[PDB]
Design a binder for this molecule. Structure first.
Ligand SMILES: Nc1ncnc2c1ncn2[C@@H]1O[C@H](COP(=O)(O)OP(=O)(O)O)[C@@H](O)[C@H]1O
Ligand SMILES: Nc1ncnc2c1ncn2[C@@H]1O[C@H](COP(=O)(O)OP(=O)(O)O)[C@@H](O)[C@H]1O
Ligand SMILES: [Mg+2]
Ligand SMILES: [Mg+2]
Lengths: 537, 78, 526, 109
């Protein structure tokens, strides 16, 4: 574009102000604003086709050629190798929506792009970009209040989980896993409700292990109330099933003790050598005897062990797992109700965990084995074991189920619920239009633009569903204003009715509010930029 | 209403000192030394536990053993 | 406007973003390329490919396995990579169907491109395909038959399934031979699914019919120097001890003395420790000692002086298979002999195969593991025979697990297509036009099977479709003469597991590739 | 949230008007509570105008709903001493949850 400085002097002497000013570029003012708006519109029009049940996916290829098929706006924009700084800002915006909510990552981008596209026409008419940003802030406040007004509430109890299942089904309608729609919603709900702190209103996702294994069918995905590990029993002649398992969780390798300090044990005689030999033997025997006397029928170590320990476990009928990772050790403890023991001397019958079933699982013609721990009493940990025909659908299933879990988390944090299908956006657009009518200052135009931008989500849903955008949206808006019903939206699935409260299409109020707030704040930060400086090449 | 222990202390099984070298010529002394390392750590942890502090913060690492100790005593460590 | 065709390009130098039609074009072309590649290997009259790597090793493989073919090609189309991974996952789940799932996915995607050209949304298409998948699932499951109860009929079904799995492969030359081999080898597992128990030894030379299934077991390990070579009524100790400069696990332990005499005393004490270990071993009352780890000169000498055959350096798989074949317990501690179970076999000798000697265990106790000696004229023949045998053994194991069987020769695909057709002509809208395409692909499967033989695929598939519309649910392709016949009589039966997996994985991959309307590539790492 | 305002010659007309925070008044009803008795519904009208009356008094009702201001007017004739009680108004709001019924202070006739 334009250069930093183009004089070189009114006297002919060199004029060097900035380093590599000749290789550097600069864009200033309205042309800079329009470049920003063009970039943002490009990103938003890329994303808008991945919106809604009839939304399509994108195939992302990384540097090393790995393929990722997804409908998740945050994953798409993260996999996208963007160079434009405004596109980077939009990627950050979507990532922020994903961090805070875990859903809406495409709505935020579409809405921000629409806001900037309307600011484009407002700037053409000559309004100051800061005035545009302030009108957008005003309209965003109005829309947030209207969302709080039209919101509904759902019960987050563990007895009737139908509202939560409906919410999760709405969230998962747009993902490839809608083939197992209700199974996935059920397992997301049961997962969060099993592991969720109702009193604190907190949900720790480290306690939800989402594991995937190629093979089987997507319908085989299930919720394990317990843990799955990628290990097998240490000895090949151990039993592959253990019922009523009393579990000893240990972070001590079944090996002779060893000081952490630099140590040298000196052997100075045949008697010293034989004493050392007998010490080693008796250490192994004493370890196994302590584990047996604790009453355990199963051992789980974190640091692996050797041939003598393995065979002694086998002889003493103590199936054992080794080389289990720290996180899985923690999850097994939490699930079985056991305490992690750092050495055998500290092991007691009360520190043991209990699992009604510990089994080794095969996966066809593979030679790889997995260990399932389940039938615990009150497991505060849980595992989601995902199956499918390829790693692409497995990864998409993982991220979609993450979206569902995050949505249930947002419900546990705030039970208020708005109805989707663009209905909430149409209602907020109506409210913003009314407030713009009551506004007599120059921000009227910015607020009308905000309404026209809010209306892009119903239009996008209709377009992706093949309906005519303008016709469908105007008819449902007219119906909303005539018969007061903010649950009137786009019949994306062609169920006949436009009532999203009847179709059980459900969004989170904090989710929608976060969408609107993030889009408005980022659009403000973009409109406030009027000069770009970048290094050459 | 927690009482909070603010420390600059590494709480984990480690070489008691970097220029320290243990020398024993007996398996009884070997086992004594192992248990002595463990008792050093456990004594630090027991003092921290008996101070009444339910929250523990260290400028230095807090190992997995100390983490699990505090978890069993229903304390918090970072 | 668009991400790529905008006044500003939003991408780093080297990236790209194919939009709707361009993306669907590259996806369909990649998938259909993969499918056209992997077909012509489909069916009894399918032909093999030469892989001919281009690395500095220039590996050379002659394969008929679709999974192997797809694994060994340099693919750069993302949809093609999807199909490749799908075939790999099929090969992991079951051992057969890796070419049929790929061909099915490719044909479905061809029909989907046709429908897109017919101006049908690639969500109406996926909807209709899901309905068709349901119909096909139900038709297949209703057509399945189970014979696991009847032992004789189950054995016959196993022989027929092995024959059908081998028909397509290089072993069809000696199909009646390798079928019996594979069935006996899978029955020797006694219900277990451990396919590692079935060891396959490829010995260059001899004819492909010289291959056999050893009545006992064979091991490619050596015997010690001063130790016997023949042992009748062998009592065997399978171990995982060190027996090789075996040091006390105390690692800070060091010998620090003031006298070479004391150093010599300590060395003698080490030797005495090894001797006492060997004596504890011999107190089990054994004639053979197998160790997963090495056996050094001194324990070798001790076992020789004791008259024990000491086989060393067997591996984890070696000792597992030996425990399965003899009944012993893999041990590492010998302080409780009363608790260590020993293995038994009537005889252990050394036999010759090609130019190499192998330990031969005859008269074994359990036999829950097997050894198959594969002989052949070329290393390529041997590798393809191993791959084909692996296919057959995997399928027979999966059938012993789930005894449900399903007739082959296109009977199953035609039945599913018949059900999909009923659903289609009873359903309104363009979902019917997509179900009809689903059925067209299902029919195109046996169409390709017949094409690869050289028959009038169109005429024969028309006859098959007419038969399955009339109600002859057991009509299939008779590939001997090139007509239609009764699969129940001809013995052309497949595993319901494998056919269901083919169907479902193909439909799933086609769905996941069809949902794509944009391909955003990132700058190659180069 | 919903603020309700309400306004004997043996026809009486009693009004009830709603204001405050809402977006829809799902149902509007008139209730009566005689001393030492249990509240019953005089009448109630829906948004679609469909009104269902009660059994002890029916056929003489002229309950009318002004949607332009979300208010209601019940014209009752054939007055009687047993109609002498406190007349309560009910307002079903927004979605129609059990926490959406808003009562008035009641008008004694
Ligand atoms: N079954 C449905 N019918 C109508 N609209 C739906 C349905 N499911 C989801 N939507 C709408 O689609 C919009 C886009 O959501 P989606 O793209 O699936 O998630 P995200 O926006 O987080 O990627 C949401 O605003 C939601 O209201
Ligand atoms: N003897 C036979 N007669 C008729 N059809 C056969 C025969 N053997 C195999 N087939 C058919 O060929 C297909 C198997 O071909 P194959 O090369 O094994 O493909 P894949 O690797 O996908 O299993 C099956 O669909 C089966 O119906
Ligand atoms: Mg979503
Ligand atoms: Mg085959």
């Amino acid at each position: 574009a334009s250069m930093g400085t183009l004089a070189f002097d009114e006297y002919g002497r060199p004029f060097l102000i900035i380093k590599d000013q000749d290789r550097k570029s600069r864009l200033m003012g309205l042309e800079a604003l329009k470049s920003h708006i063009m970039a943002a519109k490009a990103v938003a029009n890329t994303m808008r086709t991945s919106l809604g049940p009839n939304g399509l996916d994108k195939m992302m290829v990384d540097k090393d050629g790995d393929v990722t098929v997804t409908n998740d706006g945050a994953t798409i924009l993260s996999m996208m190798d963007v160079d434009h700084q405004i596109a980077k800002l939009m990627v950050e915006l979507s990532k922020s929506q994903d961090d805070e909510i875990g859903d809406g990552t495409t709505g935020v981008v579409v809405l921000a792009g629409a806001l900037l596209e309307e600011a484009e026409q407002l700037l053409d008419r000559g309004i100051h970009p800061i005035r545009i940003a302030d009108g957008y802030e005003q309209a965003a406040r109005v829309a947030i209040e209207h969302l709080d007004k039209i919101s509904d509430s759902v019960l987050v109890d563990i007895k009737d989980t139908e509202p939560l299942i409906q919410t999760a089904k709405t969230t998962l309608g747009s993902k490839v896993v809608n083939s197992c729609h209700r199974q996935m919603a059920e397992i997301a709900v049961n997962a969060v409700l099993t592991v969720a702190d109702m009193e604190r209103r907190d949900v720790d996702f480290e306690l939800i292990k989402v594991e995937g294994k190629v093979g089987g069918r997507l319908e085989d995905t299930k919720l394990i109330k317990g843990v799955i590990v990628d290990k097998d029993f240490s000895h090949p002649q151990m039993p592959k099933k253990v019922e009523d398992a009393k579990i000893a969780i240990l972070t001590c390798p079944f090996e002779p003790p060893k000081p952490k300090t630099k140590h040298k044990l000196d052997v100075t005689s045949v008697e010293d050598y034989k004493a050392l030999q007998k010490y080693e033997k008796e250490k192994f025997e004493e370890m196994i005897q302590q584990i047996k006397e604790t009453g355990a029928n199963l051992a789980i170590c974190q640091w692996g062990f050797d041939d003598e320990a393995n065979h002694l476990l086998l002889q003493n009928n103590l199936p054992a797992v080794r080389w289990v990772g720290g996180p899985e050790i923690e999850l097994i403890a939490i699930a079985t109700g056991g305490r992690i023991v750092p050495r055998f001397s500290e092991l007691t019958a009360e520190k043991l965990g209990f699992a009604g079933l510990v089994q080794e699982i095969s996966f066809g013609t593979t030679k790889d084995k997995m260990l399932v721990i389940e039938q615990c009493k009150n497991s505060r940990a849980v595992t989601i074991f995902i199956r499918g025909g390829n790693k692409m659908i497995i990864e998409e299933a993982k991220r979609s189920l993450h979206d569902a879990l995050c949505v249930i988390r947002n419900l546990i944090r705030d039970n208020r619920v708005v109805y989707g299908g663009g209905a909430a956006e149409i209602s907020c657009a109506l409210a913003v239009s009314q407030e713009a009518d009551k506004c007599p200052t120059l921000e009227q135009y910015a607020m009308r633009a905000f309404a026209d931008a809010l209306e892009v989500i119903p239009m996008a849903l209709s377009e992706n569903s093949g309906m005519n955008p303008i016709q469908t949206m105007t008819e449902v808006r007219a119906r909303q204003v005539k018969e007061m019903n903010p649950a009137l939206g786009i019949d994306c699935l062609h169920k006949g009715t436009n009532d999203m409260k009847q179709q059980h299409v459900i969004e989170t109020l904090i989710g929608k509010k976060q969408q609107i707030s993030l889009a408005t704040q980022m659009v403000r930060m973009i409109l406030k930029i009027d000069d770009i400086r970048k290094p050459g090449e | 209403n927690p009482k909070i222990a603010l420390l600059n202390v590494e709480l984990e099984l480690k070489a008691e000192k970097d220029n320290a070298e243990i020398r024993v010529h007996t398996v009884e002394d070997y086992q004594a030394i192992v248990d002595a390392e463990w008792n050093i750590l456990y004594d630090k942890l027991e003092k921290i536990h008996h101070s009444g502090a339910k929250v523990v913060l260290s400028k230095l690492p807090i190992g997995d053993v100390a983490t699990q100790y505090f978890a069993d005593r229903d304390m918090f460590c970072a | 406007a668009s991400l790529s065709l905008a006044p500003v390009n939003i991408f780093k130098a080297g990236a790209d973003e194919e939009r709707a039609e361009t993306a669907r074009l590259t996806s369909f072309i990649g998938a259909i390329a993969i499918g056209d590649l992997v077909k012509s290997t489909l069916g009894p009259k399918g032909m093999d490919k030469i892989l001919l790597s281009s690395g500095r090793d220039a590996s050379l493989m002659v394969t008929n396995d679709g999974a192997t073919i797809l694994k060994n090609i340099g693919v750069d189309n993302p949809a093609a990579k999807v199909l490749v991974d799908m075939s790999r996952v099929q090969d992991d789940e079951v051992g057969d169907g890796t070419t049929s799932v790929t061909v099915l996915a490719a044909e479905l995607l061809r029909e989907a491109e046709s429908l897109i050209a017919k101006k049908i949304h690639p969500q109406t298409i996926i909807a209709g395909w899901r309905e068709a998948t349901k119909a096909a699932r139900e038709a297949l499951l209703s057509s399945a038959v189970d014979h696991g109860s009847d032992e004789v009929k189950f054995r016959q079904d196993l022989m027929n399934i092995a024959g059908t799995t081998l028909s397509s492969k290089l072993l069809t030359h000696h199909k009646d031979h390798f079928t019996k081999l594979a069935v006996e080898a899978v029955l020797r597992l006694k219900g277990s699914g451990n396919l590692e128990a079935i060891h396959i030894i490829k010995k260059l030379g001899g004819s492909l019919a010289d291959s056999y299934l050893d009545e006992g077991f064979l091991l490619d390990k050596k015997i010690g120097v001063n130790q016997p070579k023949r042992i009748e009524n062998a009592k065997i100790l399978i171990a995982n001890t060190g027996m090789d400069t075996d040091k006390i696990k105390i690692f800070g332990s060091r010998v620090r003395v003031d006298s070479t005499a004391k150093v010599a005393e300590i060395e003698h004490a080490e030797k005495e420790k090894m001797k006492e270990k060997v004596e504890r071993i011999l107190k089990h009352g054994i004639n053979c000692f197998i160790n997963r780890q090495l056996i050094y000169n001194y324990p070798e000498q001790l076992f020789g002086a004791a008259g024990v055959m000491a086989i060393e350096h067997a591996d984890f798989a070696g000792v597992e298979r030996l425990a399965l074949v003899t009944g012993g317990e893999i041990a590492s501690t010998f302080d409780h002999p009363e608790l260590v179970k020993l293995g038994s076999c009537k005889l252990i000798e050394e036999v010759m195969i090609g130019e190499d000697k192998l330990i031969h265990f005859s008269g074994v106790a359990l036999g829950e593991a097997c050894t198959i000696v594969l002989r052949g004229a070329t290393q390529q023949i041997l590798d393809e025979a191993e791959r084909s045998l692996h296919d057959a053994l995997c399928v027979l194991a999966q059938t012993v697990k789930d005894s449900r069987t399903v007739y082959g020769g296109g009977c199953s695909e035609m039945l599913m297509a018949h059900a999909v057709t009923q659903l289609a002509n009873r359903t309104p809208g363009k979902e019917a036009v997509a179900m009809e395409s689903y059925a067209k692909a299902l029919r195109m499967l046996p169409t390709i099977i017949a094409d690869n033989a050289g028959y009038d695929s169109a005429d024969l598939v028309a006859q098959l479709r007419a038969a399955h519309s009339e109600g002859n649910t057991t009509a299939g392709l008779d590939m001997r003469e090139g007509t239609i016949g009764d699969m129940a009589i001809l013995g052309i039966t497949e595993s319901f597991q494998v056919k269901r997996q083919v169907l479902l994985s193909a439909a799933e991959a086609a769905e996941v590739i069809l949902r794509v309307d944009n391909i955003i590539k990132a700058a190659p790492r180069k | 949230q919903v603020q309700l305002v309400e306004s004997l010659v043996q026809s009486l007309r009693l009004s009830c008007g709603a204001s405050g925070t809402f977006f829809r008044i799902n149902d509007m009803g008139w209730y009566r509570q005689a001393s030492g008795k249990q509240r019953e519904l005089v009448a109630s009208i829906t948004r679609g105008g469909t009104t269902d009356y009660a059994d002890s008094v029916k056929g003489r009702f002229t309950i009318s709903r002004d949607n332009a201001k979300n208010t209601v007017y019940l014209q009752m004739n054939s007055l009687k001493p047993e109609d002498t009680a406190v007349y309560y108004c009910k307002a079903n709001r927004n979605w129609g949850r059990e926490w959406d019924d808003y009562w008035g202070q009641g008008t004694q006739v």
